[PDB]
Design a protein around this ligand. Sequence first.
Ligand code: HEC
Ligand SMILES: [Cl-]
Length: 81
Amino acid sequence: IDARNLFEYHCAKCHGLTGEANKRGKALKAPDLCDPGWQNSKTDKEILYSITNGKNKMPAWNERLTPEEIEALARYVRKLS
Ligand code: HEC
Ligand SMILES: [Cl-]
């Protein structure tokens, strides 16, 4: 699975290509995925859950993405630090 490319289409809209949240993401109170501080405040089961189910006001991706695709993405979110 090409998790980078799934990410940049689906996700980079808010988190930015590098995972520093851009002005769209900042305005929605997005975190900086790229931040080691943030990365260390979450687990993988937490990340997988939030992509699958949505997080506070944010929608779930388990319609548009397969479980496989969500896992690759979770592993990709980790590669941004
Ligand atoms: C804006 C329109 C977003 C898009 C598109 C995606 N995400 Fe997101 N994400 C966004 C916000 C505003 C937040 C914070 C929500 C809050 O109230 O805390 C998040 C959060 C995440 C997280 C962290 C989840 C957690 O429980 O802390 C992750 C791992 C994450 N987002 C990843 C992610 C992926 C993989 C996306 C594409 C499939 C994606 N997000 C889309 C804003 C937006
Ligand atoms: Cl999309």
